[PDB]
Amino acid sequence: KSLHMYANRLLDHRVPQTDMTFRHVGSKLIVAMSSWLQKASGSLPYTQ
Amino acid sequence: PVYNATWSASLKNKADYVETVLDSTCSSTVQFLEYELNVLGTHKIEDGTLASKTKGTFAHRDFSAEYEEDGKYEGLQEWEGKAHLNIKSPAFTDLHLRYQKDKKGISTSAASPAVGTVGMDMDEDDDFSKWNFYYSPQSSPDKKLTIFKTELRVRESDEETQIKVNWEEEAASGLLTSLKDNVPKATGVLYDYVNKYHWEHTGLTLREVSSKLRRNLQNNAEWVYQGAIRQIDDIDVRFQ
Amino acid sequence: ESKRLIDLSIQNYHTFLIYITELLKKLQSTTVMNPYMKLAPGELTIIL
């Protein structure tokens, strides 16, 4: 519940004159991390 | 002969009440530097309580200031009365300030022809209290835009107490627009003011004086330049 | 330039207050402790 409400807080606020929430930037960084992970050798189901 | 100024003051005791009279005036060869200021205040201490009535009025070319005070002073924390200020400025905008204080309510506001009317009212009572800070638009003196409001309410049932704070974005935005629109209003009055004084003394505008300064700079530059050129021929000829 | 500054100030002030109200509402949803806070657009009420 605490993580849910924190995510709601993060989603619901951003600086004026920009409507892109920081969660999209977080998702972009997560995508980059996942791309690097799949690039990394020694893959395991735990990585999946 | 050029300048004459008189400062007259007098403190007088008349049995039950004191009277304060102040006068000040100046006669000058400068037109906008002559005035007369006057104030009168009667002060009666009745069995320890003070009843106060005073009038202060100013006269000058660019405006006149007129203030009225009335009321009484009980102890050091109970003043009940009214204070009214009215300013008539040909040089700039006029103003009229009204202050009121009763034992259960304080009300005061300022009526400005540029900003409008800005006022605040404090109603105080044992079990409730309310602060109101409102801005009436210059274009609409019939309504009050609540800049902010506070409402203290101690519940007579149970031990709960409510604090209610309210504000209007509309009031703030309207006041900000009025202020940004007021910039040229002050700019023009001050510009015409300085030009008026320049006229009263030398008959020139600020821009006219700037042009005169530029022209004199050019004239002096040529005065230097001609001699600078001539010296070359002088030196050459003497060397020959 | 003065008028432009005041215009931008009003613009960002308005664009910003709504995000603040949303964040405040999400935060108030977090807890229900005995002192009860009620948030409204342009208003806040405090019960003690």
Given a contact cutoff of 8 angstroms between Cβ atoms, the answer to whether B191 and C17 are in contact is no
Given a contact cutoff of 8 angstroms between Cβ atoms, the answer to whether B102 and B81 are in contact is no
- Token duo for residue B105: 């309510």
Cα distances (Å, whole numbers) of residue B36 to B19, B25, B26, B90: 20, 4, 7, 17
How many helices and strands (H and E) does chain A possess? 2, 0
Please give the helix or strand (H or E) that residue B29 lies within, else none: none
Cα distances (Å, whole numbers) of residue C33 to B162, C29, C46, C48: 16, 11, 13, 11
- Token duo for residue B165: 């704070």
Nearest to B176 among C10, C44, C48 (CB): C10
Given a contact cutoff of 8 angstroms between Cβ atoms, the answer to whether C21 and C28 are in contact is no
Given a contact cutoff of 8 angstroms between Cβ atoms, the answer to whether B135 and B171 are in contact is yes
* Long-range Cβ contacts of B149-152 (<8 Å, 24+ apart): B152/B128
| Resolution attained, angstroms | 9.0
Given a contact cutoff of 8 angstroms between Cβ atoms, the answer to whether B20 and B40 are in contact is yes
With contacts defined as CB-CB under 8 Å, which chain C residues touch B164? 43-46
Whether the CB of B126 is below 8 Å from some CB of chain C: the reply is no
C48 with B173: Cβ contact below 8 A: no
What type of residue is B75?
A: G
Given a contact cutoff of 8 angstroms between Cβ atoms, the answer to whether C47 and B160 are in contact is yes
Distance CA B118, CA B97 (A): 10
Given a contact cutoff of 8 angstroms between Cβ atoms, the answer to whether B79 and B100 are in contact is no
Given a contact cutoff of 8 angstroms between Cβ atoms, the answer to whether B106 and B83 are in contact is no
Question: What is the rounded radius of gyration, in angstroms, for the C-alpha atoms of chain C?
Answer: 15
| Distance of residue A15 Cα from the nearest chain C Cα, in angstroms | 7
Given a contact cutoff of 8 angstroms between Cβ atoms, the answer to whether B107 and B80 are in contact is no
Nearest to C29 by CA among B62, B49, B79, A6: A6
C6 with B179: Cβ contact below 8 A: yes
Report helix angle B169-202 to B206-239, nearest 10.
Answer: 60
Distance CA A29, CA A35 (A): 10
Distance CA B64, CA B184 (A): 24
Sign for the CA dihedral angle at B223, B228, B230, B234 comes to positive
Output DSSP code: residue B34: -
Complete DSSP assignment for C1-48: -HHHHHHHHHHHHHHHHHHHHHHHHHHHTT---SS-EEEETTEEEEE-
Sign for the CA dihedral angle at B222, B228, B234, B236 comes to negative
Please give the helix or strand (H or E) that residue B149 lies within, else none: strand B145-154
Q: Please, which experimental method was used?
A: cryo-EM
